[PDB]
Design a protein around this ligand. Sequence first.
Ligand SMILES: O=c1ccn([C@@H]2O[C@H](COP(=O)(O)OP(=O)(O)O[C@H]3O[C@H](CO)[C@H](O)[C@H](O)[C@H]3O)[C@@H](O)[C@H]2O)c(=O)[nH]1
Ligand SMILES: O=c1ccn([C@@H]2O[C@H](COP(=O)(O)OP(=O)(O)OP(=O)(O)O)[C@@H](O)[C@H]2O)c(=O)[nH]1
Length: 294
Amino acid sequence: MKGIILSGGSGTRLYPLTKVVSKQLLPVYDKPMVYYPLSVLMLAGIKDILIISTPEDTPRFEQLLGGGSELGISLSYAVQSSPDGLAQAFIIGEEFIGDDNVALVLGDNIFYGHGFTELLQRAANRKSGATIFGYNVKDPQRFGVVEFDEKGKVISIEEKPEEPKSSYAVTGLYFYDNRVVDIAKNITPSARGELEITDVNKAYLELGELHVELLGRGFAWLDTGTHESLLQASQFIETIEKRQSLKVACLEEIAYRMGYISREQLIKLAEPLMKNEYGQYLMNLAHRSKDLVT
Ligand SMILES: O=c1ccn([C@@H]2O[C@H](COP(=O)(O)OP(=O)(O)O[C@H]3O[C@H](CO)[C@H](O)[C@H](O)[C@H]3O)[C@@H](O)[C@H]2O)c(=O)[nH]1
Ligand SMILES: O=c1ccn([C@@H]2O[C@H](COP(=O)(O)OP(=O)(O)OP(=O)(O)O)[C@@H](O)[C@H]2O)c(=O)[nH]1
């Protein structure tokens, strides 16, 4: 499975934060926002990942993350010249996808909770259809809204409905089989002038092949849409990390835990960062007994 992080857009709502910085390089507490959705794909077992951003910002993501070899993965980059919609990811990414199945995650979405990896790995395992993730939000009209029956079968999906049919938003993580690329080429722009992921999902729903995993109330799903919500997301991650000996979305740690890189390789990453707490954390992990790490 391949993965794509869609990490463009103007971040209009966060102005002036986004005048000269990409929204997905802004902090969520202690790390750039993009580390969080990247860590999600990594934990899904996805090792071939394309990062899409603006003509100005794409070089900066590449400066941040590099080609992935440090992390035992492959990262590639592509430019979206104008933010013409989520579903344009599969058009830009057509050559990258090839014949493979693909997951899309939004560069501004933060998922957190116990058992998430197991849901991701199950979605990544599922060779046919589309899997989307529903979450009970306060204002479902702000999002895509998925309506499901008593067995969790999808009945409808609607982008920002005036009268929502459920309280479950469609979060910014989507798993598709290879049909998605041709689907994306055949949808047309909405009233807001975008190629809509909801219309990709509706194509799968027409075929009876849209599947929803519901993320229950024990999961946290944030987006970093506004100044307020961004600060809230930071506060949430700070609470979790302050209490624990473990970090969230520490990419090098995940590379090591997933066996993508060795203890020796992790030491080599930690060395030039020993001047800071992040390096120290990595070095403590690399020297930790292999039994304790398991
Ligand atoms: O062409 C684009 C369009 C958007 N984005 C980025 O993608 C993210 C999502 O965009 P919005 O915040 O505008 O979200 P939408 O209103 O497009 O909502 C979309 O994402 C939601 C989850 O956060 C729901 O899944 C919804 O159904 C889906 O349409 C933003 O960071 C945006 O900057 C791009 O990089 N390129
Ligand atoms: O090395 C890691 C592992 C996990 N995570 C993040 O921690 C959260 C929980 O990750 P899991 O989905 O592994 O659940 P958990 O660790 O609470 O449960 P155990 O299986 O360990 O008992 C998920 O949000 C995941 O993204 C990291 O950020 N880094």
